[PDB]
Scaffold this active site. Structure first.
Site, PDB file in Angstrom:
ATOM      1  N   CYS A  46       0.855  -1.178   0.000  1.00  0.00           N
ATOM      2  CA  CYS A  46       0.000   0.000   0.000  1.00  0.00           C
ATOM      3  C   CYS A  46       0.899   1.238   0.000  1.00  0.00           C
ATOM      4  O   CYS A  46       2.049   1.173   0.446  1.00  0.00           O
ATOM      5  CB  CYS A  46      -0.899  -0.005   1.244  1.00  0.00           C
ATOM      6  N   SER A  48       0.691   3.735   1.865  1.00  0.00           N
ATOM      7  CA  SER A  48       0.958   4.095   3.264  1.00  0.00           C
ATOM      8  C   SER A  48       2.254   3.485   3.811  1.00  0.00           C
ATOM      9  O   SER A  48       2.887   4.061   4.699  1.00  0.00           O
ATOM     10  CB  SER A  48      -0.223   3.728   4.153  1.00  0.00           C
ATOM     11  N   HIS A  51       4.761   5.662   2.533  1.00  0.00           N
ATOM     12  CA  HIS A  51       4.678   6.909   3.298  1.00  0.00           C
ATOM     13  C   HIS A  51       5.635   6.805   4.487  1.00  0.00           C
ATOM     14  O   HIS A  51       6.250   7.784   4.882  1.00  0.00           O
ATOM     15  CB  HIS A  51       3.247   7.161   3.801  1.00  0.00           C
ATOM     16  N   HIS A  67       0.955  -3.680   6.627  1.00  0.00           N
ATOM     17  CA  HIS A  67      -0.292  -3.656   7.381  1.00  0.00           C
ATOM     18  C   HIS A  67      -1.474  -4.261   6.623  1.00  0.00           C
ATOM     19  O   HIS A  67      -2.531  -4.466   7.206  1.00  0.00           O
ATOM     20  CB  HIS A  67      -0.625  -2.220   7.807  1.00  0.00           C
ATOM     21  N   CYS A 174      -6.696  -3.716   3.752  1.00  0.00           N
ATOM     22  CA  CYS A 174      -6.590  -2.262   3.645  1.00  0.00           C
ATOM     23  C   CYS A 174      -7.199  -1.637   2.394  1.00  0.00           C
ATOM     24  O   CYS A 174      -8.340  -1.184   2.422  1.00  0.00           O
ATOM     25  CB  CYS A 174      -5.143  -1.771   3.802  1.00  0.00           C
TER      26      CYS A 174
HETATM   27  N1  LIG Z   1      -7.625   6.534   5.415  1.00  0.00           N
HETATM   28  C1  LIG Z   1      -7.154   5.299   5.255  1.00  0.00           C
HETATM   29  O1  LIG Z   1      -7.518   4.388   5.980  1.00  0.00           O
HETATM   30  C2  LIG Z   1      -6.223   5.029   4.057  1.00  0.00           C
HETATM   31  C3  LIG Z   1      -6.138   3.734   3.564  1.00  0.00           C
HETATM   32  C4  LIG Z   1      -5.432   3.396   2.414  1.00  0.00           C
HETATM   33  C5  LIG Z   1      -4.720   4.368   1.733  1.00  0.00           C
HETATM   34  N2  LIG Z   1      -4.761   5.682   2.224  1.00  0.00           N
HETATM   35  C6  LIG Z   1      -4.019   6.724   1.493  1.00  0.00           C
HETATM   36  O2  LIG Z   1      -4.618   7.017   0.223  1.00  0.00           O
HETATM   37  C7  LIG Z   1      -3.602   7.441  -0.681  1.00  0.00           C
HETATM   38  C8  LIG Z   1      -3.575   6.621  -1.950  1.00  0.00           C
HETATM   39  O3  LIG Z   1      -3.410   5.223  -1.671  1.00  0.00           O
HETATM   40  P1  LIG Z   1      -3.191   4.295  -2.954  1.00  0.00           P
HETATM   41  O4  LIG Z   1      -2.571   3.064  -2.407  1.00  0.00           O
HETATM   42  O5  LIG Z   1      -4.493   4.226  -3.654  1.00  0.00           O
HETATM   43  O6  LIG Z   1      -2.081   5.205  -3.658  1.00  0.00           O
HETATM   44  P2  LIG Z   1      -1.401   5.292  -5.095  1.00  0.00           P
HETATM   45  O7  LIG Z   1      -0.077   5.908  -5.029  1.00  0.00           O
HETATM   46  O8  LIG Z   1      -1.478   3.977  -5.738  1.00  0.00           O
HETATM   47  O9  LIG Z   1      -2.425   6.333  -5.760  1.00  0.00           O
HETATM   48  C9  LIG Z   1      -2.258   7.755  -5.655  1.00  0.00           C
HETATM   49  C10 LIG Z   1      -2.735   8.197  -7.008  1.00  0.00           C
HETATM   50  O10 LIG Z   1      -2.983   9.584  -7.027  1.00  0.00           O
HETATM   51  C11 LIG Z   1      -2.340  10.117  -8.189  1.00  0.00           C
HETATM   52  N3  LIG Z   1      -1.945  11.515  -8.005  1.00  0.00           N
HETATM   53  C12 LIG Z   1      -0.815  11.994  -7.431  1.00  0.00           C
HETATM   54  N4  LIG Z   1      -0.809  13.335  -7.429  1.00  0.00           N
HETATM   55  C13 LIG Z   1      -1.974  13.631  -8.014  1.00  0.00           C
HETATM   56  C14 LIG Z   1      -2.427  14.910  -8.260  1.00  0.00           C
HETATM   57  N5  LIG Z   1      -1.736  15.988  -7.882  1.00  0.00           N
HETATM   58  N6  LIG Z   1      -3.594  14.968  -8.920  1.00  0.00           N
HETATM   59  C15 LIG Z   1      -4.305  13.913  -9.332  1.00  0.00           C
HETATM   60  N7  LIG Z   1      -3.853  12.690  -9.086  1.00  0.00           N
HETATM   61  C16 LIG Z   1      -2.698  12.530  -8.410  1.00  0.00           C
HETATM   62  C17 LIG Z   1      -1.215   9.198  -8.579  1.00  0.00           C
HETATM   63  O11 LIG Z   1      -0.915   9.259  -9.987  1.00  0.00           O
HETATM   64  C18 LIG Z   1      -1.819   7.870  -8.198  1.00  0.00           C
HETATM   65  O12 LIG Z   1      -2.497   7.280  -9.327  1.00  0.00           O
HETATM   66  C19 LIG Z   1      -2.308   7.389   0.081  1.00  0.00           C
HETATM   67  O13 LIG Z   1      -2.072   8.676   0.627  1.00  0.00           O
HETATM   68  C20 LIG Z   1      -2.591   6.375   1.177  1.00  0.00           C
HETATM   69  O14 LIG Z   1      -1.728   6.577   2.306  1.00  0.00           O
HETATM   70  C21 LIG Z   1      -5.514   6.014   3.369  1.00  0.00           C
HETATM   71 ZN   LIG Z   2      -2.953   0.992   3.664  1.00  0.00          ZN
END
Ligand SMILES: NC(=O)c1ccc[n+]([C@@H]2O[C@H](COP(=O)([O-])OP(=O)(O)OC[C@H]3O[C@@H](n4cnc5c(N)ncnc54)[C@H](O)[C@@H]3O)[C@@H](O)[C@H]2O)c1
Ligand SMILES: [Zn+2]
Ligand SMILES: NC(=O)c1ccc[n+]([C@@H]2O[C@H](COP(=O)([O-])OP(=O)(O)OC[C@H]3O[C@@H](n4cnc5c(N)ncnc54)[C@H](O)[C@@H]3O)[C@@H](O)[C@H]2O)c1
Ligand SMILES: [Zn+2]
Ligand SMILES: [Zn+2]
Ligand SMILES: [Zn+2]
Lengths: 374, 374
Positions: A46, A48, A51, A67, A174
């Site tokens: 993921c 995160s 991160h 996780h 997740c």
């Molecule tokens: N709240 C929670 O429980 C939780 C759970 C899972 C993931 N997250 C968070 O969600 C986010 C994404 O997770 P993911 O695994 O889907 O990530 P990922 O990196 O696979 O996806 C992020 C996407 O956003 C795009 N992006 C980046 N900058 C952008 C911008 N300025 N404009 C438009 N698009 C943009 C990227 O090209 C990518 O496709 C992360 O920050 C992750 O930590 C939070």
């Molecule tokens: Zn996650």
């Protein structure tokens, strides 16, 4: 037998930030009372976890991250009643102690026993079960799935279907449950509605899956990487927009497309600016914007309160609002029942040993989800 | 008589910002098609009318402010079907055209024909009906109740009970409905919940009334003016706290007081700092914070998005979320049925002539609501 004794195995340890993981041997102490030692079978990468590597999500180092996974119980400590050895399980990075104020609330899911708000990097008892080079190593969100074996508290583990394909259902740990729950559970997308999803990665695709299930008439995918659009359309996106193609701000573009603003918007990137934009793009009087993305550590966003005064609702959520322990098994069940698909999120599979390559795949934007097999 | 003719009467004209209202003679043009000319009977002095004076709420000057009122229709224009001369009415500063996406939305109320987002200070047709010393004067939110006579568009007026006590029911034009709806309609306060209301003036006391009516078990009032505590408790507050009595930030105190955060918090002051504080004091996983206060013009607030990510819901609302033309008559009826009280909000009753004195009573901290009778 390994029950009751220390187990040496390999794990991907993060010693410093912005450095590759170190696949090396660690010693995993047996489970204490109400703790469970799990033999990991599969774990997903993921954003995160990255991160953590980047310092976006601060948690104590050195650490064994991970996780989002699934494995098989090796042994249980004294007093464990929910899992037995041999059970397939999914580690809960958001626990469900069932005793706190949040757990007893019909809506809340962010258990107060969580290690996400004020990261200690330990077990509930404030100690570690990991030793590497003789040095104690930190846990991550009480799960630490980047290890052939891990020990978790009972409240951080869910027993799932004995027939569950662990290489797929690990995503329910997740990515899938987060995005899906954010749409159907947190924002509560309605039939005929117009949704906007910023970020088309694992979690964003899951949100699109959530909006489609909810019956959204329009699902607009937003991503600066056009390569992400095909997959999004595939899972439900009716159209996709790249902010970089427009001379005007995307919230304006979106407001025109939806003839005045979307019904439901989702921030699934993790940037302060997109969070404000996502909020600005939902209808001023009745629009709802849900934050899913993890922001850069301690940074504050700037926004005009009139965005809210006009009527907008802004909320965020952890793990898609799902009470972890009750939900995870129900979600695995539905997957078994073909209620939703996980395949579209899986783009790469690699052995645990190739963990470093998997993160390069994420960083290159080439992948959505790389599943690591132990 | 006056019908279809130009009427000359006294109005309170604000020529410049930060100046007392100029009580002079003005000329009120007859109503055009779908317009209504109303003789004002009573108008409440709301803090928003003062925001205009102070420049906190920008709207074209010179103008005849005033939006919280009640009167009697003097004449209606060609095509008016909802009211007739002799009808007791209440002008609506947030109209209900009944044909835009918002009015058609089951939960929207901030009608697209509103003049609050981007103030023009005109009638729906772009012109004014007010003249003073040969100069055209602006309308305020399409109501302009600080005049013996006013002309409003049919969409900005509602017919109310003929046996209505206009000097009391005028509060239903703003303060009361705003605070009441914010609590019962927007926030939707649950039975047995803990609420915290920032700002104990006319709108705030009404938030408390609504919280109590909603069944709230605990209602903490917060104000820097201790003189406001007696009435707050009279209307429902279980306790009141003055921020300056503490060495530490009030969100801390409130969190400790509510054992982890309150269920519902309300910002009814209009400050960026108390808006963030209000959100921060509601429980992190399931708390709901509603912004009722109008912030100072063009200022952005700064907040950490983690407050939302954990689970908090943040909303804002115009006129308590009430669909104006639908609800106002209903609220008056309920008032007539003794369903809620208005007397607690009324601290002063002065003649229209003394408009400036009433603003001075508000500014000094002495008054809640001063009703000006014409
Ligand atoms: N709240 C929670 O429980 C939780 C759970 C899972 C993931 N997250 C968070 O969600 C986010 C994404 O997770 P993911 O695994 O889907 O990530 P990922 O990196 O696979 O996806 C992020 C996407 O956003 C795009 N992006 C980046 N900058 C952008 C911008 N300025 N404009 C438009 N698009 C943009 C990227 O090209 C990518 O496709 C992360 O920050 C992750 O930590 C939070
Ligand atoms: Zn996650
Ligand atoms: N959204 C809407 O539809 C709507 C409708 C009516 C009023 N309002 C707004 O609500 C706000 C309050 O209006 P009101 O009519 O009740 O006015 P008011 O001035 O009578 O009440 C404001 C109260 O907050 C207090 N206060 C000021 N600073 C404080 C601080 N730093 N901490 C704690 N308390 C503090 C004041 O002592 C006072 O009692 C205003 O901004 C008004 O414009 C909004
Ligand atoms: Zn709990
Ligand atoms: Zn309308
Ligand atoms: Zn008002």
């Amino acid at each position: 037998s390994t029950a009751g004794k220390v187990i040496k195995c390999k794990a991907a340890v993060l010693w410093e930030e912005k450095k590759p993981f170190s696949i090396e041997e660690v010693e995993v102490a047996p489970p204490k009372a109400h703790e469970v030692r799990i033999k990991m079978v599969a774990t997903g990468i993921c954003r995160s976890d990255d991160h953590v590597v980047s310092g976006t999500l601060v948690t104590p180092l050195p650490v064994i991250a991970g996780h989002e996974a699934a494995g098989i119980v090796e042994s249980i400590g004294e007093g464990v009643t929910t899992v037995r050895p041999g059970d397939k399980v999914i580690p809960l990075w958001t626990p469900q102690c069932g005793k706190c104020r949040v757990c007893k609330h019909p809506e809340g899911n962010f258990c107060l026993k969580n290690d996400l708000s004020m990261p200690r990097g330990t077990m509930q008892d404030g100690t570690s079960r990991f030793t590497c080079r003789g040095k104690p190593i930190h846990h991550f969100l009480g799960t630490s799935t980047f290890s052939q074996y891990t020990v978790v508290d009972e409240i951080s583990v869910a027993k799932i279907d004995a027939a569950s394909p662990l290489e797929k259902v690990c995503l329910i740990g997740c990515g899938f449950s987060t995005g899906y729950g954010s749409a159907v559970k947190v924002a509560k997308v309605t039939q005929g509605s117009t949704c906007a999803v910023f970020g088309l990665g694992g979690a964003g695709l899951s949100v699109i899956m959530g909006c489609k299930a909810a019956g959204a008439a329009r699902i607009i995918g937003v991503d600066i990487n056009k390569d992400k659009f095909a997959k999004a359309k595939e899972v439900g996106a009716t159209e996709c927009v790249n902010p970089q193609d427009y001379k005007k701000p995307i919230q304006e573009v979106l407001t025109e497309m939806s003839n005045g603003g979307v019904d439901f918007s989702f921030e699934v990137i993790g940037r302060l600016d997109t969070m404000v934009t996502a909020l600005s793009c939902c209808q001023e009087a009745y629009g709802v914007s849900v934050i899913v993305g993890v922001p850069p550590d301690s940074q504050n966003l700037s926004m005009n309160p009139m965005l809210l005064l006009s009527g907008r609702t802004w909320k965020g959520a952890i793990f898609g609002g799902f009470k972890s322990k009750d939900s995870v098994p129900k979600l695995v069940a539905d997957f078994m029942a073909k209620k939703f698909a996980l395949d579209p999120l899986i783009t790469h599979v690699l052995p645990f040993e190739k963990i470093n390559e998997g993160f390069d795949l994420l960083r290159s934007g080439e992948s959505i989800r790389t599943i690591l097999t132990f």
